[PDB]
Symmetry: D3
Subunit: 159 residues, 6 copies
């Protein structure tokens, strides 16, 4: 039996929370696409190419993980790649509303794609990317929250 | 790659919500144990044997689902059955607290068992077993909420 | 156009929160039944007759409010009284889950009965009956939380 | 006894969720104004005139519903129209905070206007307008979520 | 300036979460009473004397912490001890409702006593005493969740 | 024993909710800095100097409160001022997520700074600054929500 899962997000940038979730998804499913949405209208700090390069560095040890950027409808991209499982995180109760909305919308768009949720380790659940960037903008130490090469890119982006 | 998942609960009795979640788990994983906890101290309405018999009737069409009752530590039962994935439902934000507590406890008890969460269909998410029993006690129609043989057993239990 | 609303609860005992909600419902609808469920299996402190007598004293100034005790299915009682609107309170986010479950169940039981929700005044929203009783058991002052005759009955019940 | 209710919102555009709530309000109250706030500072996709025209098409079968655009304080508009009831939706727990804030503010602005809340059908509760627009921008099917003429206008707005 | 804080609870038994909160309160305030409510009607597993003895062992290194059992109204006990600050934990969003209710009730009972809240370390926030006892009843390892002497007493209580 | 607390925020502008929290913090701690973040990237309505002047007027009666504007990392500012306690508000469950994220981030940035939370009076808990500004923009009365001199400045800012 073969599961092809998609882990979609803007990953701007990939964090230690994302790394925990993709590592766990990697262990459970045959193949995982870490799918990075262009999200142009959402004004990312890093370009799609920069985000893809960071995610590849961070997920390199995971054999059955593939990083792909995409600009289309997520449901269309999943269909294209024959994915049948969408994996998303729930850091705390507050994440539930939007995951429920997305999962219901995706149910309409691609009835065969099942959404499943993982709760990140307690080490990473409080991590908000906006707050990490805010701390970085003020020169605060963000090394615990991001992979090494991500910390390096973020600091460079802000210097 | 082979996933053996456990879907544990008291299932007192199995509802259309449980049926939706086990059917979806059945489609995703190689094998699913629908594991019914004795839960003696939690005072179930149906005996363990009655609950196992109902769950077998309701899950009979699902080839790769096995129904087993258990009285021990859930983590010990999973280890015994070489399960590596625990599947649980999240009906709404309110279910998150207890799933987060259980998942963290289970992480300590069996570090290799991953917990994953499914959100039931909008058709069934509002279903509370206590409220279904309350309605049944007052002679109200509960046919939409439970499989046919479960409705039959519940009505008999209450007549 | 004529609205007959039902405001159902265990009212064990009626509080200043209930009084605020029934007073507001009284102002909006043609007629309001303040319907007191027997709720025998839920072990009320006050008998149904005691609860009905307290609610009558407290709602006496409200011309178009009628207090009735009932032991059947709430939906059946509403049908019996030709009620088309069920009014319930939401004190805070935490009350939402159970109101959503009840409203969906009631939708199945009586499709024509509409449930509508009021948020109690900030003066009363934090009031929990269990906590008021707990404070009363320890001789603490509960006069702000209950109508005068209710405070009198509760104190007598506990002396 | 006569209830004039106001159902205020930005309605950008009116959705099947709004239609469900206004239809239910229509059944309960003598008259309903579906009041569309200009909300200029909130940058709507559709002009006020476009939104009013869509809401009129969608609410045409409801005899006692009137659609009006307004740019002033909602409380002032309600006073102007002698409305005594404000109806708003609660899709899930997450909507509670803002409704509680608005209702308290409106209590100060117009003490006689009562706010009352309806929970939309399970068919529509997960619908977020931002997410529907996002799906539409990517060419995904949004026909289940919006009335036919709204789907038509949205698609045209985005082509 | 001198702060005498009270940290009240049933402490049945004291956990590593309680220890974290009392240690932090100890660092901030001049004196802390760790106040153990008899809570007879709430059916504790450990007697008041057993709970007091466990809390004394666990808080012994904290110079300015005093452990006292009490059976009266918490507000009366605080007044008796001239406490002006009540410290309580918030493990997650789900704890907020009851703390808000208690704090408002305590405001009425003793207007000069201020309630203040601490969030436990991420190491301990998921710990539920009921779930720890449930795991202990089934022979599971609970050593990470309770101080050593508490683990010893609990195991003995259950053997 | 000496507590130096910091109460940080954008205070754009200071509200009666902030005044309640700082007054309570003033009563509990030896010294309180009401610290106003420049928050340039968050586009405040009032300049930092305007916000500092308003906060000084409103906190003038509080002997042990000092108002200071700052543009750096909050943790760095606290270290600079030898603060050991950070005080923040929790108006309702909805505020918990962001306070938990901030508190965890601040734990990493300055391990010795303890965060503690106060719940504002029921009089002020529903107050949202964005909604007060929205009401002010439409000429509605906001006098209950802001100190007198703040109402004066806001009205002038909007005329
Ligand atoms: C991109 C897409 C997957 C959303 O992903 P995402 O959650 O926004 O991406 P990320 O996990 O990397 O995080 C994005 C932002 O929202 C936050 N976020 C993510 N999940 C969240 C949740 N469930 N609740 C609240 N915030 C959340 C992120 O943390 C980040 O905020 P931050 O910058 O402060 O960290 C989704 O919109 C998508 O499928 N895009 C393609 C177009 C499409 O198909 N749209 C319709 C899908 S139904
Ligand atoms: C049995 C066990 C899996 C819990 O399962 P469960 O969720 O209670 O079983 P069910 O899904 O059938 O429901 C049980 C009751 O709690 C409710 N419930 C289930 N999940 C819930 C959630 N996350 N939040 C709130 N309520 C929930 C159920 O609906 C039911 O209530 P109801 O009678 O009104 O319907 C768990 O305690 C267990 O693993 N037992 C074995 C012993 C053990 O190992 N304990 C330690 C595990 S960390
Ligand atoms: C009685 C009935 C209306 C529920 O009412 P109720 O909310 O329990 O009655 P009250 O408002 O007086 O409060 C009952 C208890 O639950 C609490 N409560 C009420 N609404 C709540 C909410 N939505 N969320 C959490 N707790 C709530 C009450 O405060 C009280 O607890 P307390 O003793 O600490 O104060 C309902 O079960 C009923 O319709 N009974 C008749 C039988 C029936 O038809 N059942 C099926 C209906 S779908
Ligand atoms: C317009 C007004 C009624 C708010 O209405 P509204 O809820 O924003 O309008 P809609 O229901 O059509 O939705 C507006 C946006 O916020 C969302 N929303 C609506 N209610 C919500 C809730 N309670 N919680 C979270 N989001 C909500 C909507 O879905 C929409 O977001 P989307 O574009 O992703 O769909 C209100 O601000 C108003 O009265 N305006 C007039 C000026 C005024 O009087 N202001 C002070 C009133 S106290
Ligand atoms: C005892 C008293 C302080 C409550 O304390 P407490 O929170 O129940 O005591 P603990 O922190 O040790 O925990 C008690 C139980 O409720 C849980 N709990 C504690 N705080 C909680 C919260 N805010 N939300 C949900 N559950 C909570 C505990 O974890 C424990 O459950 P568990 O056995 O699964 O672990 C309170 O009722 C009191 O002041 N008692 C004296 C009498 C009185 O004055 N009453 C009126 C006070 S307003
Ligand atoms: C400024 C800082 C303290 C945040 O404070 P703040 O909460 O935003 O300031 P205020 O209390 O005056 O309110 C700011 C806005 O967010 C809202 N808000 C405040 N606390 C909130 C909460 N916990 N949840 C949701 N919204 C909240 C405010 O009400 C206001 O919104 P409004 O304009 O509608 O009223 C924080 O970002 C900071 O420390 N800044 C300095 C830079 C830094 O060190 N960053 C990293 C800290 S971990």
């Amino acid at each position: 039996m073969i599961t092809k899962a998609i882990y979609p997000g803007t990953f701007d940038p990939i964090t230690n929370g994302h790394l925990d979730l993709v590592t766990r998804a990697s262990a459970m499913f045959s193949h995982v696409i870490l799918a990075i949405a262009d999200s142009s209208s959402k004004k990312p700090m890093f370009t799609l190419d920069e985000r893809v390069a960071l995610a590849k560095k961070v997920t390199a040890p995971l054999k059955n993980v593939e990083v792909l950027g995409f600009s289309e409808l997520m449901a269309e991209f999943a269909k294209k790649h024959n994915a049948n499982i969408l994996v998303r995180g729930l850091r705390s109760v507050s994440d539930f509303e939007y995951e429920w909305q997305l999962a219901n919308m995706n149910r309409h768009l691609m009835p065969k794609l099942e959404s499943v949720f993982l709760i990140p380790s307690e080490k990473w659940s409080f991590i908000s990317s906006s707050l990490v960037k805010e701390v970085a903008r003020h020169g605060g130490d963000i090394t615990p929250f991001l992979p090494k090469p991500v910390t390096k890119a973020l600091l460079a982006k802000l210097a």
